[PDB]
Design a protein around this motif. Structure first.
Motif, mmCIF file in Angstrom:
data_model
loop_
_atom_site.group_PDB
_atom_site.id
_atom_site.type_symbol
_atom_site.label_atom_id
_atom_site.label_comp_id
_atom_site.label_asym_id
_atom_site.label_seq_id
_atom_site.Cartn_x
_atom_site.Cartn_y
_atom_site.Cartn_z
ATOM 1 N N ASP B 15 -0.487 6.213 2.814
ATOM 2 C CA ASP B 15 0.110 5.000 2.281
ATOM 3 C C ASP B 15 -0.996 4.211 1.585
ATOM 4 O OD1 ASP B 15 -1.209 3.337 4.126
ATOM 5 O OD2 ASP B 15 0.440 3.429 5.576
ATOM 6 N N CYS B 16 -0.615 3.085 0.972
ATOM 7 C CA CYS B 16 -1.540 2.271 0.201
ATOM 8 C C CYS B 16 -2.529 1.513 1.082
ATOM 9 C CB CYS B 16 -0.812 1.257 -0.673
ATOM 10 S SG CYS B 16 0.179 2.037 -1.976
ATOM 11 N N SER B 17 -2.275 1.361 2.386
ATOM 12 C CA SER B 17 -3.202 0.671 3.270
ATOM 13 C C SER B 17 -4.422 1.552 3.527
ATOM 14 C CB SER B 17 -2.585 0.247 4.581
ATOM 15 O OG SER B 17 -2.304 1.370 5.408
ATOM 16 N N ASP B 46 0.157 -2.564 -4.338
ATOM 17 C CA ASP B 46 -0.203 -3.959 -4.528
ATOM 18 C C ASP B 46 -1.384 -4.267 -3.612
ATOM 19 O OD1 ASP B 46 -0.466 -6.686 -4.859
ATOM 20 O OD2 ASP B 46 1.397 -7.175 -3.767
ATOM 21 N N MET B 47 -2.578 -4.356 -4.205
ATOM 22 C CA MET B 47 -3.785 -4.596 -3.434
ATOM 23 C C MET B 47 -4.149 -6.078 -3.429
ATOM 24 S SD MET B 47 -4.054 -1.644 -2.485
ATOM 25 C CE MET B 47 -4.626 0.055 -2.624
ATOM 26 N N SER B 48 -3.264 -6.925 -3.961
ATOM 27 C CA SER B 48 -3.389 -8.361 -3.764
ATOM 28 C C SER B 48 -2.811 -8.753 -2.406
ATOM 29 C CB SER B 48 -2.737 -9.134 -4.882
ATOM 30 O OG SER B 48 -1.323 -9.141 -4.742
ATOM 31 N N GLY B 52 -3.511 -3.505 0.399
ATOM 32 C CA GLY B 52 -2.939 -2.328 1.030
ATOM 33 C C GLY B 52 -1.416 -2.301 1.130
ATOM 34 N N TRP B 53 -0.696 -2.953 0.210
ATOM 35 C CA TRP B 53 0.756 -2.944 0.241
ATOM 36 C C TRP B 53 1.319 -1.783 -0.574
ATOM 37 C CZ3 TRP B 53 3.236 -6.187 3.475
ATOM 38 C CH2 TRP B 53 2.625 -7.385 3.841
ATOM 39 N N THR B 54 2.262 -1.050 0.026
ATOM 40 C CA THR B 54 2.962 0.035 -0.640
ATOM 41 C C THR B 54 4.287 -0.508 -1.166
ATOM 42 O OG1 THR B 54 1.969 1.641 0.881
ATOM 43 C CG2 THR B 54 3.941 2.344 -0.360
ATOM 44 N N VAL B 55 4.474 -0.557 -2.489
ATOM 45 C CA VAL B 55 5.683 -1.132 -3.051
ATOM 46 C C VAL B 55 6.810 -0.106 -2.963
ATOM 47 C CG1 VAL B 55 6.710 -1.947 -5.239
ATOM 48 C CG2 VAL B 55 4.421 -2.714 -4.555
#
Lengths: 234, 234
Positions: B15-17, B46-48, B52-55
């Motif tokens: 995942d993005c995290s 979204d790394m704002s 580490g947010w996975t859209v």
């Protein structure tokens, strides 16, 4: 596939210094498009060492064959997929790059004994194809010694099949590289990847005479450029 | 092509995290591969907002058609090329994601009057296909109000062609979206992109009742997830 980051937007960059100054601080492969280049092409951007370096040549492990003719040295060849791989950016691309701005050349060198040195030249410029991609280099500084300069007249690039106005290759040496050779052949970073000290018919390895002499072949090379007047953003 | 950064090395991220915690702080499209996913797939990270947010879903401009059937909502659809485009990640991918770790869902909302709000739910989980991708959501916090909860029993996902055990679509509404509808239909972020206040046969727009009621369609949505216990690296 590799880890790739798709920014989801497009912007054309002339070189890796413009990429860095636009806020991209990650070393990796990016597309650039110099002003006079007919197309964008991949390059490794070294964003360490103050930022914004466009890598024009790299040696690391002996994987790639540098015994290539004029065409391949003109167009570029090698590995544009792996971080630590080897390539030659291509003389046409060097010309398009070095005529759009005045660049500094930095050469990062390592030996097999975990030592490193560097050589830096202000105003590195590569001429056009009609002029045999001739090299102009300005003021030297660094720790490796000045092995590149023709004083060791602009130095023409030569390959096995384009050497002193002979186009057939009949007097070529085995494993002859593409380089801007001086009289002493004191540099050849495109030479054969030997493991440090070596012997062969000719001194045709990865040579930087002022550091380790003619019969020692270096472990790692990065040749990279950035504008003389580059100012890092933040 | 877009600006793309090729790192020149490979590593699989769930995942993005995990991407962010490995040092990648750029928002953009990356490949992820949840543990139980048969393949990697593109997602916007979204790394704002702490990183580490996975859209999982985005709405922005009304470009994409959300009047899609069960298959498309299962597989994912939309725009995975443009930064500000619209997509649905796909219910199968939501299931593979939300079963590998316990995630928080954050929903970033904006209206046409430059206002923004958010809703956040701890322990967002999406069930498997046999269970109609049923939604489980935990504790609400935020400013937008709790419009998602079925208290407004796990809520099954429905589409025009998979609605109350009817597979043919004969009682579907025009422009019927895919969602986990509650009795009040107080949320439908997959609804029709109207321009704020609207009128139609049915209240089928981008609705978040607790903020702007049933007959106001929102301008922007980002639905994104990150593990409950995410700790940002540096």
């Amino acid at each position: 596939m590799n880890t790739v980051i798709d920014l989801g937007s497009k912007r054309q960059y002339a070189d890796c210094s413009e990429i860095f100054n636009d806020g991209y601080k990650l070393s990796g492969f990016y597309k650039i498009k110099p002003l006079q280049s007919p197309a964008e092409f991949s390059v490794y951007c070294d964003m360490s060492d103050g930022g914004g370096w466009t890598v024009i040549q790299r040696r690391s492990d002996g994987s790639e064959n540098f015994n290539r003719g004029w065409k391949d040295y003109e167009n570029g060849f090698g590995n544009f997929v792996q971080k630590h791989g080897e390539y030659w950016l291509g003389n046409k691309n060097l010309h398009f790059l070095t005529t759009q701005e005045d660049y500094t050349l930095k050469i990062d060198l390592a030996d097999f004994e975990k030592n490193s040195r560097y050589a830096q030249y202000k105003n590195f410029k590569v001429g056009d194809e009609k002029n045999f991609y001739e090299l102009n280099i300005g003021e030297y500084s660094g720790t490796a010694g000045d092995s590149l300069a023709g004083n060791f007249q602009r130095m023409k690039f030569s390959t096995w099949d384009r050497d002193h106005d002979n186009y057939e290759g009949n007097c070529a040496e085995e494993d002859q590289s593409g380089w801007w050779f001086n009289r002493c052949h004191s540099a050849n970073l495109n030479g054969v990847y030997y493991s440090g000290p070596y012997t062969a018919k000719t001194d045709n390895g990865i040579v930087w005479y002022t550091w380790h002499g003619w019969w020692y072949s270096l472990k790692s090379v990065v040749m990279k450029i950035r504008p003389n007047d580059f100012i890092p953003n933040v």
